[PDB]
Amino acid sequence: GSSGSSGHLYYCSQCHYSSITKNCLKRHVIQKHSNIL
């Protein structure tokens, strides 16, 4: 047998969250974090 990490997801700019595409992930950054400089 064998072992390893899970399939690819795009990771958040400010936490450990991840999603399918940047087009979904940006909504998490808009809603859950301070999306400012």
Q: Which is nearer to Zn ion, 10 or 17 (CB)?
A: 17
Integer Cα distance of 12 and 17 in angstroms: 5
Integer Cα distance of 19 and 34 in angstroms: 18
Residues 8-37 within binding reach of Zn ion (CB under 5 A): 12, 14-15, 17
Which residues make up each annotated binding site for Zn(2+)? 12, 15, 28, 33
Integer Cα distance of 20 and 16 in angstroms: 14
Q: Which is nearer to Zn ion, 5 or 31 (CB)?
A: 31
Instruction: Enumerate binding residues for Zn ion (CB under 5 A).
Output: 12, 14-15, 17
